[PDB]
């Protein structure tokens, strides 16, 4: 359940619990039944401290779920700017394609998250990707 616990702790945004689970040897790359990892769940939920914790402990920055969303896709679509930056600093593929062939910039543009679009562009997002 160490993988499962971490998934839930990362979703819930419970920062101390996450550190304790990782120190316990919890798999930072655990996946749930639609391919979501702790990093996905922290990103989509806006839990910035947790994203950084996961990445520092070697979480797969470019892990894709059942839709082909990377944590960057999920942060970009929900408008969590600080997380988009973090993920980028840890080598998230700015032009990662989901199963529609959409990059995080497509997804952010569609949701009206223009500051994200702007940051993604600065980090070298290709509009014609």
């Amino acid at each position: 359940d160490l993988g499962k616990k971490l998934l839930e702790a990362a979703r819930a945004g419970q920062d101390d619990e996450v550190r304790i689970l990782i120190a316990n040897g919890a798999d930072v790359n655990a996946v749930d039944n639609t391919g979501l990892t702790p990093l996905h769940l922290a990103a989509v939920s806006g839990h910035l401290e947790i994203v950084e914790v996961l990445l520092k402990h070697g979480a797969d920055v470019d892990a894709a779920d059942v839709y082909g969303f990377t944590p960057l896709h999920l942060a970009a679509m929900t408008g969590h700017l600080e997380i988009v930056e973090v993920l980028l600093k840890y080598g998230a593929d700015v032009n990662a394609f989901d199963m529609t062939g959409s990059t995080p910039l497509h997804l952010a543009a569609d949701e009206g998250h223009l500051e994200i679009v702007e940051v993604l562009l600065k980090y070298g997002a290709d509009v014609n990707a």
């Binding site: 039944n33 639609t34 979501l36 989509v44 939920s45 059942v66 839709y67 969303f69 999920l74 679509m77 929900t78 199963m99 529609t100 997804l107 569609d110 949701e111």
Partner: protein
């Protein structure tokens, strides 16, 4: 053993096999690309080794015959079929956003406007099926597909049947539906009303976050189905709660028809969003 290129000898179109999308029963699905047009489809690939006779072979044939006759905004598009000596290839509309199953696994209970939004489309697609004398007979989250605009397309006609004459009572199915309607359990036969039952179960699942009858043992489940034993939690709104009840009745003739369903207060009033954000695949709007 699957060919990397799919050649249709009838149409002259050829398709390059791409991304694996998933298996389901006897078939694997891949994205396939028209080599000329560059259009992408769902290629459903069935090995003949598994089309080794009865309920499986003509469940392939009946399914193809039914599906190919259909064309509607809320039904998976049928683009064609062909075969070689080893496989049967079915070319379908690619729905890139998976199905309501994946949504349900992530979200559990939806907000009511989302449910209304999906359910109207499901009902409209099913209305079109009924008007063309097709009973789907296996409506479930996993065959209610979503395209890039989060529009619902009904697929998987493997259990479907054509009402050939008026008042016909179907007695047999080519497999086991996900939601067994109580009349399927009985000896009295079934008709169009089974699809209304399954839409009831779906509506309950979308609003409540869990299925209406399913328990840990199949005997107890079927018994509750037979006895109409289920419970709608109190946080469900009265209009929606009342429509679930209309659909989930033992007597098939007591349920609304598909058109009466479409015309329910639940659909003609209440909020339907112009757009669901893509975030709705993962977190509540």
């Amino acid at each position: 053993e699957i060919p990397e290129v799919l050649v249709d000898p009838r149409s002259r179109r050829r398709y390059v096999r791409g991304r694996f999308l998933g298996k389901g029963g006897f078939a694997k699905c891949f994205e396939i690309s028209d080599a000329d047009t560059k259009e992408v489809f769902a290629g459903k690939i069935v090995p003949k080794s598994l089309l080794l006779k009865p309920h499986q072979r003509e469940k392939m044939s009946m399914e193809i015959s039914i599906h190919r006759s259909l064309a509607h905004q809320h039904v998976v598009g049928f683009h064609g079929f062909f075969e070689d000596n080893d496989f049967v290839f079915v070319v379908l509309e690619l729905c890139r956003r998976r199905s309501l199953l994946e949504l349900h696994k992530r979200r559990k209970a939806l907000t009511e406007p989302e449910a209304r939004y999906y359910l109207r489309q499901i009902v409209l697609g099913c209305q079109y099926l009924h008007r063309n004398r097709v009973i789907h007979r296996d409506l479930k989250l996993g065959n209610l597909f979503l395209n890039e605009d989060l529009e619902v397309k009904i697929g998987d006609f493997g259990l479907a049947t054509k009402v050939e004459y008026d008042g016909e009572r179907k007695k047999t199915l080519c497999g086991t539906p996900n939601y067994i309607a109580p009349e399927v359990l009985s000896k009295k036969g079934h008709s169009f009303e089974v699809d209304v039952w399954s839409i009831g179960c779906i509506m309950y699942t979308l609003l409540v976050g869990k299925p209406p009858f399913e328990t840990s043992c199949l005997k107890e489940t079927y018994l509750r189905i037979k006895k109409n034993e289920y419970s709608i939690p109190k946080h469900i709104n009265p209009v929606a709660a009342s429509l679930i009840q209309k659909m989930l009745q033992t007597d098939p003739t007591a349920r609304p028809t598909i058109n009466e369903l479409l015309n329910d207060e639940f659909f003609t009033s209440g909020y339907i969003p112009a757009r669901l954000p893509i975030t709705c695949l993962t977190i509540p709007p």
